[PDB]
Design a protein around this ligand. Structure first.
Ligand SMILES: Cc1cc2nc3c(=O)[nH]c(=O)nc-3n(C[C@H](O)[C@H](O)[C@H](O)COP(=O)(O)OP(=O)(O)OC[C@H]3O[C@@H](n4cnc5c(N)ncnc54)[C@H](O)[C@@H]3O)c2cc1C
Length: 430
């Protein structure tokens, strides 16, 4: 049984992006009685066997309330990995630690989860328009909208922008890193013949294995999949040097990834593994980071940013997509409770509920990023608990929390009172 949406709220919503924030906002809004159209520029969900992601329990509980079929749909795509073996740049063992969530989260592939959420949204009857490039955001009194493919104008009660780190909505709302990440996937047939690399296949038939190396401004993670028949890895590094007046296209070579690891005294075993990567299965994406914004909401109050467009994280917290999902849920829940004649209030309300929680984690990823690239090996040796992968994040329910505080936040925005955020730790630090 697919959940039947609530009574029509009379609220039309334009959602930009088919990522985690956009699909979340669209599905939750539809089920809460809103009239949803989702606009995405790509023609199909991109499928990459190496794009592995961790969805935390705080987002899994939200996704589960959209249909029980999803748990049985993503199950064969969930990794059975339990621990990550941390090592230094000398290739010396630090510690094994559990992955976060105590097994209540989802360690799976991105495109296969997005495809399931895309199909579930279609079964619900949500108007999803692919191949629809959004630009030229605009806003008036009572309505806001976008231009699709520079030919079609759409207008609605509000526009929720989840167009990622490369957000044109952000630039329109505001008017205003040096790191990169190798990403790769491979089969292990050729690697199994190499005795300098075959070590990575140990114990893989029983359970997926994870190895991570930290040190000297470099991070490397290797993950086995499918009983050791496949693996994926990610290498965070300083961005490749390009000339002043240089070709504006992208590039990715395994030799640069290997050269990045050359200064490591323990380079042998990691390099012996990744050197079997085929060139067609390797990318090198620059990582975007921007400090917290002054606001996620436009002046008129009917255009709002969520997800990476609002709060891009350094990928060391495993909460980017989950926080985008929390964004989409609270926004949709707030619209339902404020009503047609208070759409700007709802988005002002969702902002002050979400901004502290996403900003603590945002700044927390910036602090943890320095510690994991240039660690104090004395403190690590004294207490290895620092390196290794919080109930106030994973045990939280943004939905019921939004219901608790809605009136309190409404009175806080209007000025009747104050709002004490309790979706973050007291004296909030990550
Ligand atoms: C290396 C790395 C590892 C990560 N690991 C994790 C992890 O383990 N767990 C986790 O939770 N998060 C992780 N993240 C973060 C996670 O990838 C993002 O936070 C999440 O995708 C953000 O959701 P989103 O919906 O905002 O953005 P996106 O997923 O980026 O979605 C935006 C969508 O908008 C579309 N779009 C863009 N512009 C337009 C336009 N003009 N018109 C129409 N459509 C447009 C794009 O096609 C894209 O489909 C990681 C990030 C990185 C870089």
């Amino acid at each position: 049984a697919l959940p039947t949406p609530r009574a029509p709220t009379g609220i039309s919503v334009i959602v930009v992006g088919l990522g985690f924030g956009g699909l979340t906002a669209a599905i939750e809004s539809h089920l809460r009685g809103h009239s949803v159209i989702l606009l995405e520029k790509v023609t199909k969900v991109k499928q990459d066997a190496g794009d592995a992601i961790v969805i935390g329990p705080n987002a899994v509980r939200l996704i589960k309330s959209w249909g029980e079929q999803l748990c049985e749909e993503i199950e064969p795509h969930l990794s059975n990995a339990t621990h990550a073996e941390m090592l230094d740049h000398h290739d010396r063992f630090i510690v094994r630690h559990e992955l976060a969530g105590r097994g209540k989260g989802w360690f799976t592939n991105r495109g296969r989860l997005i495809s399931i959420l895309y199909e579930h949204a279609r079964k619900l009857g949500i108007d999803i328009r692919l191949g629809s490039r959004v630009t030229k955001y605009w806003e008036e009194d009572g309505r806001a909208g976008v231009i699709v493919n520079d030919r079609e104008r759409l207008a609605a009660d509000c526009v929720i922008c989840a167009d990622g780190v490369h957000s044109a909505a952000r630039a329109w709302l505001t008017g205003q890193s040096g790191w990169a990440n190798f990403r790769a996937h491979m089969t292990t047939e050729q690697l199994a013949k190499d005795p300098e690399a075959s070590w990575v296949l140990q114990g893989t038939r029983e359970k997926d294995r994870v190895y991570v190396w930290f040190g000297d401004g470099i991070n490397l993670a290797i993950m086995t999949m499918k009983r050791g028949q496949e693996l994926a890895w990610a290498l965070m590094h300083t961005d490749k040097f390009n000339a002043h007046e240089s070709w504006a296209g992208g590039r990715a070579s395994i030799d640069d990834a290997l050269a990045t690891l050359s200064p490591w005294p323990g380079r042998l075993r990691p390099s012996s593994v990744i050197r079997h990567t085929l060139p067609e299965k390797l990318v090198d994406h620059a990582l975007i980071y921007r400090p917290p914004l002054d606001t996620w909401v436009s002046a008129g109050g009917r255009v709002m940013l969520i997800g990476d467009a609002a709060h891009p994280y350094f990928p060391v917290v495993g909460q980017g997509g989950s926080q985008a999902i929390e964004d989409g849920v609270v926004v949709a829940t707030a619209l339902e409770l404020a009503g047609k004649e208070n759409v700007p209030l709802a988005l002002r309300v969702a902002e002050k509920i979400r901004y502290p929680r996403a900003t603590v984690i945002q700044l927390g990823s910036s602090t943890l990023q320095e510690h994991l690239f240039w660690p104090d090996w004395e403190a690590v040796a004294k207490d290895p608990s620092v390196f290794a992968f919080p109930e106030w994040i994973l045990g939280h329910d943004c939905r019921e929390y939004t219901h608790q505080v809605f009136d309190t936040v409404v009175r806080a925005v209007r000025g009747e009172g104050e709002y004490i955020p309790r979706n973050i730790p007291a004296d909030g630090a990550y």
